[PDB]
């Protein structure tokens, strides 16, 4: 029977995780998503090129 | 005479385990699809001291493939693990310290612990402090690897059975002497009621076979047969050798 302004602070994860915890996991969540899109860039370029490279072995 | 201490431990009134500060049954994950074929990610969050156990435990968080949920499993920590570390369990999992592999996808001369006797046993062989199982041999016909247990006696185990890589943590526990008797008390205080053991020869002839007589002597041979009965078996049971052994065990 207390107001929830006293229970919580106004931020993302609020009254559960600390501010420096939210600091890091935003930086992680962002930076991993940048690395995950490069997994396409490496494979799409190489695996498509592998079909050209493997055909040279037959000729 | 009376029922001897030997005989009356199996009743289980006082002679029972003290499971107050015991964390949980230290076991492996269940089998099937995910770890049969591929592998799964797991994150070690805590490394805990279990009460009355020479082994620091580890609690790893895995996902449920069929639900939006999380199931924690209590692993025995091998010396090398740390909190905030990834673990890889399955057939296709790689060979590192902590990772759980089946015996078939492992080369000869490797080191492991918490090994299953069957597949789906959830652990049995080599769970104590500073112990580890070594893989020797292999077979194509009959999925059955050759394995050496830490006592010395070798054993044939199925190839699909599991084993966590590395030596079990908390090693060199036996090296320090206990000194004062109060240190020994606190060891058995968090296990069973098996300590202050009186010598059977000091007792009366009613309470124990060796007991009785004007001088404290046994009287007859302490080497007792395998084909005996409960009450008689107090001494060396089915002994091949006696006396001081030299070097080779």
């Amino acid at each position: 029977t207390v107001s929830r302004t006293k229970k919580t602070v106004s931020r993302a994860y609020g009254g559960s995780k600390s501010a420096n915890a939210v600091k890091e996991r935003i930086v992680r969540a962002f930076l991993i998503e940048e690395q995950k899109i490069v997994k396409r860039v490496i494979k799409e370029q190489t695996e498509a090129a592998k079909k050209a490279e493997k055909k040279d072995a037959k000729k | 005479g009376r029922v001897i201490r030997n005989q009356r431990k199996g009743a289980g009134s006082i002679f029972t385990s003290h499971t107050r500060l015991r964390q949980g049954a230290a076991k492996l994950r269940n089998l099937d699809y995910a770890e049969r074929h591929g592998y799964i990610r797991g994150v070690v969050k805590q490394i805990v001291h279990d009460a009355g156990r020479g082994a620091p435990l580890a609690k790893v968080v895995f996902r449920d493939p069929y639900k939006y949920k999380l199931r924690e499993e209590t692993f025995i920590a091998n010396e090398g693990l740390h909190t905030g570390q990834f673990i890889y369990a399955g057939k296709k999992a790689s060979l590192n310290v902590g990772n759980v592999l089946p015996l078939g996808s492992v080369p000869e001369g490797t080191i492991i612990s918490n090994v299953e006797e069957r597949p789906g046993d959830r652990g049995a062989l080599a769970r104590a402090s500073g112990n580890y199982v070594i893989v020797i041999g292999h077979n194509p016909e009959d999925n059955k690897t050759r394995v050496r247990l830490p006592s010395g006696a070798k054993k044939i185990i199925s190839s699909d059975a599991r084993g966590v890589i590395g030596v079990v943590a908390g090693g060199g526990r036996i090296d320090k002497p206990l000194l004062k008797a109060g240190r020994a008390f606190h060891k058995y205080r968090v296990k069973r009621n098996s300590w202050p053991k009186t010598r059977g020869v000091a007792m009366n002839p009613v309470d124990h076979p060796h007991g009785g007589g004007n001088h404290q002597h046994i009287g007859k041979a302490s080497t007792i047969s395998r084909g005996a009965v409960s009450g008689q078996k107090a001494g060396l049971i089915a002994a091949r050798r006696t006396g001081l052994l030299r070097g080779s065990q």
């Binding site: - | 699809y33 995910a34 074929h37 591929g38 592998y39 799964i40 990610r41 449920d64 493939p65 069929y66 639900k67 939006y68």
Partner: protein, 233 residues
Amino acid sequence: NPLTKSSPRNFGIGQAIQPKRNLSRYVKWPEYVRLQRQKKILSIRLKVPPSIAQFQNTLDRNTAAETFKLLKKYSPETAAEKKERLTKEAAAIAEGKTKQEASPKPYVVKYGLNHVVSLIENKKAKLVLIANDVDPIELVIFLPALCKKMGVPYAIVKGKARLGTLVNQKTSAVAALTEVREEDEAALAKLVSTINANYLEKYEDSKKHWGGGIMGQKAQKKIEKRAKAAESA
């Protein structure tokens, strides 16, 4: 088109929660369901004797339909039609006094096991129809051997329920004919000659051969694979 976006899920072992599949194969049934399904299998795997094996030789779909078209004629009275007949009886007896010829002579199919066995024993029954799924087989197993000795046409047929439907019953077990009208005698003898080819003529043949000894799917592919590698290497 513009604001809409595609999003593939990927169910590659570790990635994503798996979708809803039909797991009808992996359901834990009740104990009574597991009993009746395993009782089917236990009889098939063991070698069944020739006396039990002959009930598998059932009447085919095309021939059977003609038989029950015949036997739905010469069916017994419904409870209302018996009450109709007894009112006619009471009228003629009071004013007339005539039993034995009045309310004609009924032509009707014979049923009941103890009732039918006596007709076969005195060479009276022309056609007989035996059920394939009686609870103890001991009840109905000896009837094929009895009809052989006396030279009576007989035919095993599916559904003890279907024999019950033509006689106002839940289950009948057996159903035989004796008396029949002269108009429908031509069609009856046509069925007997068709029946005797399968059942009565092949009694000495059916007595010899054993049934059973049929393995499950995992056992079949194990034997076929093992036979291929060693012999045809």
